[PDB]
């Protein structure tokens, strides 16, 4: 009977996440180029042992958008690989020198690495999570809760 | 809320669980008149109870319905419970659970008739019958110790470790404040003064409660009272005349440490405490020795905690510390502890309920209250 027919979806159109967060200006192929030039710098920084300069350069740009999963996943693969190749005693010297903007890019992607354990080693992400929150404070998680959903 | 009704053999102590101290404290007495009731009308009653009897006593045969912590006279014990609920607390007992108490090693039938009268006469909604020397240990803020409770009719020890009682090591002694009152009449008779009647037994109780004290070393106190004025002092009777007393002031309490005075073969309260500690398993004895807990009104004599610590330290090995815990409110600690217990949230699962009594009969108390 009529009680179950929804009408709100067709007479009161709700907000969309692109009304609440401004849409990305860069086109899909323009970010797919911008990431594909950075991932080789991060892969190279591991192969020359300077993995910490790998993270500093990889973290200089971030891909976001519902149009780019096939390259957000490649950026996350490079980021988790770089986090798995930094020595745990070097972490406090990296984190205290990151800007609050860079920190909010680290902890945003470690919560993407923690969402897919069948492809990423959680043990090193939880170690980065303890050190980044202990050094930079609890508000750095609150800026992830509040962040863009297509990051 | 639930009532806590510690119907002790000398005083009823009653009130509400979670209240600070008992609000209904009165003699566990029923008085009946003994004289020619000549004036017609006059508001006369066939019997009087509690402070109503104690204040009229010059014309009454006062009798306690309860002796050595055992109810002897149920027709008058119902009269005391009826006075407690309807006249002294002014409640309806059919509205509130009662936590009652009794001393350990009582008759089974005492505990049965006391549950039957609560459910069948007072129509109570639920009830429980705690051991008095367990309650006194809640009132101490402890979960291990050895409670020496001593009231008007009974003295007993209950050793507890980590909240487990050691029931093989429970000691009862049928000696307390009423035997010290009867002994004070037997020794007051030697100075010049005769007290005989059930009413005169209250005058000498009111002497015992404020002239007596415990000597720290009786055999040297005895020589000091036999050679100086300083130990003697006096008390003024209802008839205005003065009673002067001396070595009677500490010979009376000394019966607790020397029961041979009233013809009993037993250990005193000090050696009864040690005979209970030495019945316990060897690893717990240190934590009993550091937590002896005094309770009940017979432990109120000035200097009894100093004497008790002296006599136990002589019996115990000198290698280890003895403490006697004796709060100023130890006068009511069994009621105080029942008022803690009846307010603990797990306790509301432990009551005998009306429906459960109706179905199980009065033997339910034997398979629920211990």
């Amino acid at each position: 009977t009529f009680r179950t027919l929804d009408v709100d979806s067709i007479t009161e159109p709700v907000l969309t996440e692109q009304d609440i967060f401004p849409i990305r200006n860069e086109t899909a192929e323009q970010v797919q180029a911008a990431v594909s030039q950075l991932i080789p710098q991060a892969r190279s920084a591991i192969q020359t042992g300077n993995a910490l300069q790998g993270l500093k350069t990889l973290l200089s740009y971030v891909p976001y958008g519902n149009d780019v999963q096939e390259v957000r996943t490649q950026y996350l693969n490079a980021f988790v690989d770089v986090l798995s190749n930094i020595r745990a005693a070097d972490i406090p010297a990296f984190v205290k020198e990151c800007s609050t903007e860079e920190i909010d890019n680290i902890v945003n992607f470690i919560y993407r690495g923690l969402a897919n354990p069948q492809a990423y080693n959680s043990s090193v992400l939880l170690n980065w999570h303890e050190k980044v929150v202990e050094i930079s404070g609890i508000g750095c998680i609150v800026r992830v809760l509040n962040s863009r959903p297509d990051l | 809320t639930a009532l806590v009704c510690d119907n002790g053999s000398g005083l009823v102590k009653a009130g509400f669980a979670g209240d600070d101290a008992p609000r209904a404290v009165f003699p566990s007495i029923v008085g009946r008149p003994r004289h020619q009731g000549v004036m017609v009308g006059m508001g006369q009653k066939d019997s009087y109870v509690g402070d109503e009897a104690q204040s009229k006593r010059g014309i009454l045969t006062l009798k306690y319905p309860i002796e050595h912590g055992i109810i002897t006279n149920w027709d008058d014990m119902e009269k005391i419970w009826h006075h407690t609920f309807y006249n002294e607390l002014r409640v309806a007992p059919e509205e509130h659970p009662t936590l009652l108490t009794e001393a350990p090693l009582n008759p089974k039938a005492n505990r049965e008739k006391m549950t039957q009268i609560m459910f069948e006469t007072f129509n109570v909604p639920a009830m429980y019958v705690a051991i008095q020397a367990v309650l006194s240990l809640y009132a101490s803020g402890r979960t291990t110790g050895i409670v020496l409770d001593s009231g008007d009719g009974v003295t007993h020890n209950v050793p507890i470790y980590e909240g487990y009682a050691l029931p093989h090591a429970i000691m009862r002694l049928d000696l307390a404040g009423r035997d010290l009152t009867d002994y004070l009449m037997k020794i007051l008779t030697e100075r010049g003064y005769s007290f005989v009647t059930t009413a005169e037994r209250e005058i000498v109780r009111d002497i015992k409660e404020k002239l007596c004290y415990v000597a720290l070393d009786f055999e040297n106190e005895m020589a000091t009272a036999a050679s100086s004025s300083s130990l003697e002092k006096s008390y003024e009777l209802p008839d205005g005349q003065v009673i002067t007393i001396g070595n009677e002031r500490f010979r009376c309490p000394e019966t607790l440490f020397q029961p041979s005075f009233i013809g009993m073969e037993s250990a005193g309260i000090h050696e009864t405490t040690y005979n209970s500690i030495m019945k316990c398993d060897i690893d717990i004895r240190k934590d009993l020795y550091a937590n002896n807990v005094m309770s009940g009104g017979t432990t109120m004599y000035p200097g009894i905690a100093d004497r008790m610590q002296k006599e136990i330290t002589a019996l115990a090995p000198s290698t280890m510390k003895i403490k006697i815990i004796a709060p100023p409110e130890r006068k009511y600690s069994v009621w105080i502890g029942g008022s803690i217990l009846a307010s603990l949230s797990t306790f509301q699962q432990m009551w005998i309920t009306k429906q459960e009594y109706d179905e199980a009969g009065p033997s339910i108390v034997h398979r629920k209250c211990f």
């Binding site: 709700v14 043990s123 959903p149 | -």
Partner: protein, 168 residues
């Protein structure tokens, strides 16, 4: 227990304490009603992004949050079919008591073992630092509780074996 869960439970404690910033909120789609907006999901601007914290493919937390409500759901270790039965049943006693553990759901979200709903009213009338201490002290102890129950199940499997076999 703690030392192997310590990295994980400091991530869950830190996420859940950053997530429990709740408020009173009257609903935008219905008048004169408040509703726990994480649980209804009908107005998107007052939802926060759903975060996963995770040690393993088996052991995970999903944290969902909103202006007046947080939903928290967990998968716990189930490494053999005895732990699947023992966990699945133990959580049905623990959710069957939800009226007295005020923050429990009566049903988990799909594919989770147990689930919690911490609403605004709970963070006003209960100590919210003791709410996360209960969630965390549950996640530490539940593996020890369940492993102990599979010992008592072996203990009874012996009781009946000896009692049957010793009367020939």
């Amino acid at each position: 227990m703690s030392n192997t869960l310590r990295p994980y439970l400091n991530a869950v404690r830190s996420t859940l304490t950053a997530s429990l910033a709740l408020e009173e909120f009257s609903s935008e789609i219905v008048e004169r009603q408040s509703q726990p907006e994480v649980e209804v999901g009908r107005s998107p601007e007052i939802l926060l992004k759903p975060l996963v914290v995770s040690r393993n493919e088996q052991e995970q937390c999903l944290i969902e949050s909103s202006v007046n409500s947080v939903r928290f759901s967990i998968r716990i270790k189930q490494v053999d079919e005895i732990e699947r039965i023992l966990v699945r049943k133990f959580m049905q006693f623990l959710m069957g008591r939800a009226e007295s553990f005020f923050i429990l759901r009566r049903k988990p979200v799909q594919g989770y073992d147990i689930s919690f709903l911490i609403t605004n009213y709970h963070t006003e009338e209960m100590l919210k630092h003791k709410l996360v201490d209960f969630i965390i002290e549950f996640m530490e102890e539940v593996d020890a509780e369940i492993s102990e129950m599979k010992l008592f199940l072996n203990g009874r499997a012996r009781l009946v074996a000896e009692t049957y076999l010793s009367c020939f």
